[PDB]
Design a protein around this ligand. Structure first.
Ligand SMILES: Nc1nccc(Nc2cc(-c3cc4ccccc4o3)c3[nH]ncc3c2)n1
Ligand SMILES: Nc1nccc(Nc2cc(-c3cc4ccccc4o3)c3[nH]ncc3c2)n1
Ligand SMILES: Nc1nccc(Nc2cc(-c3cc4ccccc4o3)c3[nH]ncc3c2)n1
Lengths: 288, 290, 293
């Protein structure tokens, strides 16, 4: 009879963090809610990440959510959380596993890149969002810089981070709506999969400037994007048809993750053609 | 001339015993009280009775079922009485008696072990109509599940009829838009229901069940599947249909009109007579008592 | 550096009679004001005047109509006056005069014959461009009907244009998402049900939804999303046209298509590739006429 649906709660440590870590000044990632500093476990040398919040309702929420989320091996692990006094104020100090193999597009950006790595990547991010949605959490800021590789070792796991914007989203014949209203917060995660998938396939976003920005906003609202050659020349209608169903402008039209995750292109990611893509070249050139 | 005028409800105040012997045979137990066997004094016939305590939910129910009962696929209301029962005001609903049994029974003891794909379409079309009449007069039934689907008799050509309006609600220029005419998401649920029923109907078990905070997650997520053996003869078209009914976002679900114009439904008598496992699996589990 | 700035609306206050002979022959007639023919005294030319009474609503009409005016598929405001009429303050909108006829009128000025499916495609592409222009600057027209779609002249290359902004309303690298940048109700998607209605008519010559006298019939048939493609009329309209109609006449506002999708549709986009197939539309239009009655 089911057990390991039982995992430990979060005990918030109250001792000062510097008992346990050396807080260096290296910013790993500026991020939301403050910054993200690299720190070091004192009694094992090992490497970790700190993000600091002034304590409040919002912050207790970030911590509650990210904690529930750490279960999933594609969300970045919360190792420890401290309540400490800093400069007179209460703080939550969030100690994360340190992921240091780079940002998704950063890694891609320096090497060839195939449709198949695209799909594999997209399966991964796909699992992180399936897990959030199944325990009723919407992330709400899935973006390139929140998608990080663990090491620089070429099978690094990719992991989703930053719960600064996350919200709880809340008879065998009862319909989903009858088990209580979901707003529509859960489908921006899906738009996001869309935008990432697009970038992965070609090196640039479906919607950008021209500095052209009242024009970008229209283009977004209007859902005007396209699949220009050369980059999209060898990309199958199947793949294009998927992005179109994520980038729908009407949120109640997009696919759910369950539908995403069942798509033959994600489900059998390891069977997709290894078709060579521009992603990495477009990525060196378009740095600017 | 005018053939679309049907008559209003005229509640009798006369005590129901003037006309009916009220037996004690329980017949059904959903929502409010219970439905009993009763007999027409002057003619001897078999009829059903629902005990409602007057109050505002009761008056709604009678009102909607009366509008509903025009349809040949919805249990007919023969008379509504307003009587006084142990001092309390009471609405007593005399329905036609449907003694053929619930859908899944008549299906489980199908003697001739031969439930075909086609019979499934014929049933589904008939559940269709009931939902279509309902929706076309702005009622959402809101409790469409198999125990509310009963056969009139045991006759080989008995009709299927929907019952129980304990939860029914009203959902309230040639070019105007549906939105502009005036209606919340209050009626896609009937349309989910149908998906669940077709699912069971084609294979014998529900697409969603206990392992149950699980099952609730599974529903909320739309996690179901068409396992073999049972679904292996079932064509991609027919489970596209299910897919669009089981859509979790209510605005993406299909609507009865789309459903009723699906060719699998529209042209029943020309869907193949492929054997299904329904009747075996329904028989296998007296688990359906929960 | 590029700068695509077009000017603002300067409401003139000088009495309009200074500028225009004002006749009384009525070109048309709106909810909120009938449309009169006028002549410019200097150039001697032919214009249309719509008379409004000053208020928030009137000023909102004018400001939207002026913005939309930039689009070559919309009837263009040429001038706006604020004058005193019968001791009432008034908004006098001057517009280009279009005397080509309403869309369906022009269609039944032919016996000849052959209104073909490609021509229909072209016509929808033209109404579609008016809706894309509007919608891309966050206006919803909201009364897109056969009777507000006017040809410029009876000449052979008259332009189809949309008019009447008396019901219109406004609204409100990067990864944000259409919602997460300002809300926005569904006033837009009804413009889109209208293209479907107009498309339906165009393809066979009678509406998808009518009162049989059965107008509670019709109200119902509309909420149901209940119509069909009868033969003989639809017998050789391709399936894809019917499916485009289906996307447009979805009863769920959020299910319907967007003009961006509409305009990217192959039957709209690659017009020159749609069959030249004859169509019962002019005949039916002509047979019917009881439209007035
Ligand atoms: N929860 C949260 N909220 C907000 C922000 C945030 N950023 C963040 C960023 C990096 C990063 C980026 C990078 C780039 C190169 C090398 C190491 C690198 O490390 C991280 N590595 N490990 C954890 C971690 C967390 N995380
Ligand atoms: N309106 C309403 N509200 C609530 C409940 C409800 N149940 C109900 C049930 C049966 C039934 C069930 C059954 C089972 C076996 C044989 C004959 C059987 O008959 C009925 N037969 N006729 C009318 C009728 C109405 N009906
Ligand atoms: N802005 C606005 N608001 C409300 C209404 C409205 N109707 C309208 C109508 C006609 C028309 C119709 C017609 C039919 C035949 C011949 C000439 C014809 O001219 C017009 N011609 N030119 C401008 C113009 C504006 N316009």
């Amino acid at each position: 009879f089911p057990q390991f649906h039982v995992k430990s709660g979060l005990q918030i440590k109250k001792n000062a963090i510097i008992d346990d870590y050396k807080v260096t000044s290296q910013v790993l990632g500026l991020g939301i809610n403050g910054k993200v500093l690299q720190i070091f476990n004192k009694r094992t040398q090992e490497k970790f990440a700190l993000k600091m919040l002034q304590d409040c309702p919002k912050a207790r929420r970030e911590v509650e959510l990210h904690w529930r989320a750490s279960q999933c091996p594609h969300i970045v692990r919360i190792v420890d959380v401290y309540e400490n006094l800093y400069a007179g104020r209460k703080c939550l100090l969030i100690v994360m596993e340190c992921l240091d193999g780079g940002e998704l597009f950063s890694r891609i950006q320096d090497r060839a890149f195939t449709e198949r790595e695209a799909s594999e990547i997209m399966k991964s991010i796909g699992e992180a969002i399936q897990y959030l949605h199944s325990i009723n959490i919407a992330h709400r800021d899935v973006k390139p810089e929140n998608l990080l590789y663990t090491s620089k070792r070429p099978n690094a796991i990719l992991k989703l981070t930053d719960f600064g914007f996350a919200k709880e989203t809340t008879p065998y014949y009862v319909a989903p709506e009858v088990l209580g209203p979901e707003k529509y917060d859960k489908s921006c995660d899906m738009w996001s999969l869309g935008v990432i998938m697009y970038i992965l396939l070609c090196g640039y976003p479906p919607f950008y400037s021209n500095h052209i920005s009242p024009g970008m906003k229209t283009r977004i609202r209007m859902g005007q994007y396209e699949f220009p050659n050369p980059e999209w020349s060898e990309v199958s209608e199947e793949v294009k048809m998927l992005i179109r169903n994520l980038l729908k402008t009407e949120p109640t039209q997009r696919m759910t993750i369950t539908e995403f995750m069942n798509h033959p292109w994600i489900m059998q990611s390891t069977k997709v053609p290894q078709t060579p893509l521009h992603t990495s070249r477009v990525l060196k050139e378009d740095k600017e």
